[PDB]
């Protein structure tokens, strides 16, 4: 766990090259990225930065043709405020460009050591 | 045995005798009930059924002298919606008999590995 800060891991470096400038995102997203890939291995997982709402998120396609996966990095220390999720919905709905559909997203709750707990949150 | 007619744990049996009729509540609430009692230590843990809202919840006194503690059972595969939480707020607020106090509640997230993760959500 010596490098999850500098950029020695290619996948980690790959993530931090995002045009936002947030070390917390890159760390937390890296941990969940490794879970998604090495545990559920979906068709496609991407890392998208939304500078205007100020958040980075992993969105991809569960199954090609489909999508419905938005996972956001969230450390245990982050308490839940409905204001943010409302902004997250807006973020996802905007990037998916779908005309105001009832959707949702999964909170990736990470402990700083290794425990990722996926908490599924809906509108 | 004398408590294995329906279940097989007296405390669990106590919990299912609630007037609602939900096996998910009794399972998940039992796991968190045992955590609260044996691990987190409370002074009073109650299990209250709100058939109106279709939720069951544990409310008691973490410390008797206070009067603000509400924990709701939420499985790791449940979907928490901002819609639900405002309903949960309404549930707790009518339970404690105050219609305007901005309050909060804890989410008791239970993993399939029996891992209870307390996630504190605020209004």
PDB file of N, CA and C in Angstrom, chain B residues 27-71:
ATOM      1  N   UNK B  27     -34.827 -10.907   9.616  1.00  0.00           N
ATOM      2  CA  UNK B  27     -33.505 -11.425   9.422  1.00  0.00           C
ATOM      3  C   UNK B  27     -32.469 -10.327   9.647  1.00  0.00           C
ATOM      4  N   UNK B  28     -32.592  -9.254   8.889  1.00  0.00           N
ATOM      5  CA  UNK B  28     -31.624  -8.180   8.925  1.00  0.00           C
ATOM      6  C   UNK B  28     -31.602  -7.474  10.283  1.00  0.00           C
ATOM      7  N   UNK B  29     -32.772  -7.248  10.856  1.00  0.00           N
ATOM      8  CA  UNK B  29     -32.848  -6.592  12.134  1.00  0.00           C
ATOM      9  C   UNK B  29     -32.254  -7.449  13.235  1.00  0.00           C
ATOM     10  N   UNK B  30     -32.393  -8.772  13.118  1.00  0.00           N
ATOM     11  CA  UNK B  30     -31.819  -9.693  14.095  1.00  0.00           C
ATOM     12  C   UNK B  30     -30.299  -9.557  14.124  1.00  0.00           C
ATOM     13  N   UNK B  31     -29.685  -9.533  12.947  1.00  0.00           N
ATOM     14  CA  UNK B  31     -28.234  -9.381  12.864  1.00  0.00           C
ATOM     15  C   UNK B  31     -27.756  -8.071  13.484  1.00  0.00           C
ATOM     16  N   UNK B  32     -28.433  -6.967  13.188  1.00  0.00           N
ATOM     17  CA  UNK B  32     -28.002  -5.699  13.746  1.00  0.00           C
ATOM     18  C   UNK B  32     -28.332  -5.621  15.247  1.00  0.00           C
ATOM     19  N   UNK B  33     -29.484  -6.181  15.641  1.00  0.00           N
ATOM     20  CA  UNK B  33     -29.891  -6.295  17.048  1.00  0.00           C
ATOM     21  C   UNK B  33     -28.784  -6.943  17.883  1.00  0.00           C
ATOM     22  N   UNK B  34     -28.263  -8.064  17.400  1.00  0.00           N
ATOM     23  CA  UNK B  34     -27.143  -8.726  18.065  1.00  0.00           C
ATOM     24  C   UNK B  34     -25.878  -7.887  18.063  1.00  0.00           C
ATOM     25  N   UNK B  35     -25.694  -7.048  17.059  1.00  0.00           N
ATOM     26  CA  UNK B  35     -24.503  -6.197  17.050  1.00  0.00           C
ATOM     27  C   UNK B  35     -24.652  -5.104  18.076  1.00  0.00           C
ATOM     28  N   UNK B  36     -25.776  -4.419  18.037  1.00  0.00           N
ATOM     29  CA  UNK B  36     -26.085  -3.345  18.975  1.00  0.00           C
ATOM     30  C   UNK B  36     -25.959  -3.800  20.406  1.00  0.00           C
ATOM     31  N   UNK B  37     -26.532  -4.923  20.704  1.00  0.00           N
ATOM     32  CA  UNK B  37     -26.494  -5.447  22.060  1.00  0.00           C
ATOM     33  C   UNK B  37     -25.110  -5.931  22.492  1.00  0.00           C
ATOM     34  N   UNK B  38     -24.526  -6.771  21.694  1.00  0.00           N
ATOM     35  CA  UNK B  38     -23.315  -7.477  22.082  1.00  0.00           C
ATOM     36  C   UNK B  38     -22.052  -6.740  21.741  1.00  0.00           C
ATOM     37  N   UNK B  39     -22.097  -5.889  20.767  1.00  0.00           N
ATOM     38  CA  UNK B  39     -20.919  -5.218  20.349  1.00  0.00           C
ATOM     39  C   UNK B  39     -20.981  -3.727  20.666  1.00  0.00           C
ATOM     40  N   UNK B  40     -22.004  -3.030  20.160  1.00  0.00           N
ATOM     41  CA  UNK B  40     -22.082  -1.584  20.313  1.00  0.00           C
ATOM     42  C   UNK B  40     -22.565  -1.190  21.716  1.00  0.00           C
ATOM     43  N   UNK B  41     -23.188  -2.148  22.444  1.00  0.00           N
ATOM     44  CA  UNK B  41     -23.762  -1.908  23.789  1.00  0.00           C
ATOM     45  C   UNK B  41     -24.761  -0.706  23.862  1.00  0.00           C
ATOM     46  N   UNK B  42     -26.049  -0.991  23.943  1.00  0.00           N
ATOM     47  CA  UNK B  42     -27.046   0.051  24.185  1.00  0.00           C
ATOM     48  C   UNK B  42     -27.721  -0.205  25.502  1.00  0.00           C
ATOM     49  N   UNK B  43     -28.390   0.801  26.003  1.00  0.00           N
ATOM     50  CA  UNK B  43     -29.169   0.676  27.218  1.00  0.00           C
ATOM     51  C   UNK B  43     -30.557   0.093  26.926  1.00  0.00           C
ATOM     52  N   UNK B  44     -31.058   0.342  25.762  1.00  0.00           N
ATOM     53  CA  UNK B  44     -32.410  -0.051  25.433  1.00  0.00           C
ATOM     54  C   UNK B  44     -32.509  -0.173  23.929  1.00  0.00           C
ATOM     55  N   UNK B  45     -32.968  -1.294  23.461  1.00  0.00           N
ATOM     56  CA  UNK B  45     -33.096  -1.528  22.047  1.00  0.00           C
ATOM     57  C   UNK B  45     -34.506  -2.000  21.807  1.00  0.00           C
ATOM     58  N   UNK B  46     -35.253  -1.310  20.991  1.00  0.00           N
ATOM     59  CA  UNK B  46     -36.623  -1.684  20.778  1.00  0.00           C
ATOM     60  C   UNK B  46     -36.809  -1.931  19.334  1.00  0.00           C
ATOM     61  N   UNK B  47     -37.771  -2.698  19.021  1.00  0.00           N
ATOM     62  CA  UNK B  47     -38.054  -3.028  17.681  1.00  0.00           C
ATOM     63  C   UNK B  47     -39.459  -2.553  17.435  1.00  0.00           C
ATOM     64  N   UNK B  48     -39.628  -1.648  16.515  1.00  0.00           N
ATOM     65  CA  UNK B  48     -40.913  -1.021  16.326  1.00  0.00           C
ATOM     66  C   UNK B  48     -41.348  -1.193  14.897  1.00  0.00           C
ATOM     67  N   UNK B  49     -42.572  -1.596  14.723  1.00  0.00           N
ATOM     68  CA  UNK B  49     -43.093  -1.800  13.422  1.00  0.00           C
ATOM     69  C   UNK B  49     -44.007  -0.680  12.990  1.00  0.00           C
ATOM     70  N   UNK B  50     -43.697  -0.112  11.856  1.00  0.00           N
ATOM     71  CA  UNK B  50     -44.518   0.913  11.251  1.00  0.00           C
ATOM     72  C   UNK B  50     -45.171   0.355  10.004  1.00  0.00           C
ATOM     73  N   UNK B  51     -46.375  -0.233  10.157  1.00  0.00           N
ATOM     74  CA  UNK B  51     -47.093  -0.886   9.058  1.00  0.00           C
ATOM     75  C   UNK B  51     -47.561   0.115   8.026  1.00  0.00           C
ATOM     76  N   UNK B  52     -47.690   1.361   8.457  1.00  0.00           N
ATOM     77  CA  UNK B  52     -48.148   2.436   7.600  1.00  0.00           C
ATOM     78  C   UNK B  52     -47.131   2.673   6.506  1.00  0.00           C
ATOM     79  N   UNK B  53     -45.892   2.689   6.915  1.00  0.00           N
ATOM     80  CA  UNK B  53     -44.819   2.964   6.006  1.00  0.00           C
ATOM     81  C   UNK B  53     -44.178   1.682   5.469  1.00  0.00           C
ATOM     82  N   UNK B  54     -44.493   0.550   6.113  1.00  0.00           N
ATOM     83  CA  UNK B  54     -44.025  -0.798   5.711  1.00  0.00           C
ATOM     84  C   UNK B  54     -42.522  -0.972   6.115  1.00  0.00           C
ATOM     85  N   UNK B  55     -42.107  -0.234   7.123  1.00  0.00           N
ATOM     86  CA  UNK B  55     -40.745  -0.398   7.682  1.00  0.00           C
ATOM     87  C   UNK B  55     -40.836  -0.855   9.126  1.00  0.00           C
ATOM     88  N   UNK B  56     -39.842  -1.564   9.541  1.00  0.00           N
ATOM     89  CA  UNK B  56     -39.640  -1.915  10.923  1.00  0.00           C
ATOM     90  C   UNK B  56     -38.296  -1.323  11.281  1.00  0.00           C
ATOM     91  N   UNK B  57     -38.119  -0.885  12.492  1.00  0.00           N
ATOM     92  CA  UNK B  57     -36.914  -0.196  12.842  1.00  0.00           C
ATOM     93  C   UNK B  57     -36.610  -0.382  14.312  1.00  0.00           C
ATOM     94  N   UNK B  58     -35.359  -0.267  14.655  1.00  0.00           N
ATOM     95  CA  UNK B  58     -34.934  -0.335  16.034  1.00  0.00           C
ATOM     96  C   UNK B  58     -34.656   1.026  16.566  1.00  0.00           C
ATOM     97  N   UNK B  59     -35.378   1.396  17.581  1.00  0.00           N
ATOM     98  CA  UNK B  59     -35.241   2.675  18.195  1.00  0.00           C
ATOM     99  C   UNK B  59     -35.173   2.423  19.672  1.00  0.00           C
ATOM    100  N   UNK B  60     -34.240   3.017  20.317  1.00  0.00           N
ATOM    101  CA  UNK B  60     -34.176   2.915  21.741  1.00  0.00           C
ATOM    102  C   UNK B  60     -33.281   3.945  22.303  1.00  0.00           C
ATOM    103  N   UNK B  61     -32.749   3.682  23.450  1.00  0.00           N
ATOM    104  CA  UNK B  61     -31.864   4.601  24.042  1.00  0.00           C
ATOM    105  C   UNK B  61     -30.482   4.023  24.033  1.00  0.00           C
ATOM    106  N   UNK B  62     -29.594   4.676  23.317  1.00  0.00           N
ATOM    107  CA  UNK B  62     -28.232   4.266  23.310  1.00  0.00           C
ATOM    108  C   UNK B  62     -27.685   4.507  24.702  1.00  0.00           C
ATOM    109  N   UNK B  63     -28.153   5.596  25.277  1.00  0.00           N
ATOM    110  CA  UNK B  63     -27.889   6.013  26.623  1.00  0.00           C
ATOM    111  C   UNK B  63     -29.221   6.526  27.147  1.00  0.00           C
ATOM    112  N   UNK B  64     -29.742   5.954  28.218  1.00  0.00           N
ATOM    113  CA  UNK B  64     -30.983   6.495  28.721  1.00  0.00           C
ATOM    114  C   UNK B  64     -30.699   7.810  29.428  1.00  0.00           C
ATOM    115  N   UNK B  65     -31.213   8.828  28.842  1.00  0.00           N
ATOM    116  CA  UNK B  65     -31.084  10.174  29.308  1.00  0.00           C
ATOM    117  C   UNK B  65     -31.179  11.022  28.092  1.00  0.00           C
ATOM    118  N   UNK B  66     -30.674  10.448  26.999  1.00  0.00           N
ATOM    119  CA  UNK B  66     -30.877  10.982  25.685  1.00  0.00           C
ATOM    120  C   UNK B  66     -32.205  10.406  25.197  1.00  0.00           C
ATOM    121  N   UNK B  67     -32.399  10.402  23.922  1.00  0.00           N
ATOM    122  CA  UNK B  67     -33.619   9.888  23.373  1.00  0.00           C
ATOM    123  C   UNK B  67     -33.592   9.980  21.892  1.00  0.00           C
ATOM    124  N   UNK B  68     -32.401   9.823  21.326  1.00  0.00           N
ATOM    125  CA  UNK B  68     -32.202   9.998  19.909  1.00  0.00           C
ATOM    126  C   UNK B  68     -31.305   8.906  19.388  1.00  0.00           C
ATOM    127  N   UNK B  69     -31.904   7.861  18.914  1.00  0.00           N
ATOM    128  CA  UNK B  69     -31.175   6.781  18.317  1.00  0.00           C
ATOM    129  C   UNK B  69     -32.143   5.992  17.457  1.00  0.00           C
ATOM    130  N   UNK B  70     -31.912   5.965  16.186  1.00  0.00           N
ATOM    131  CA  UNK B  70     -32.713   5.188  15.298  1.00  0.00           C
ATOM    132  C   UNK B  70     -31.847   4.464  14.295  1.00  0.00           C
ATOM    133  N   UNK B  71     -31.973   3.168  14.283  1.00  0.00           N
ATOM    134  CA  UNK B  71     -31.243   2.342  13.382  1.00  0.00           C
ATOM    135  C   UNK B  71     -32.217   1.553  12.517  1.00  0.00           C
TER     136      UNK B  71
END
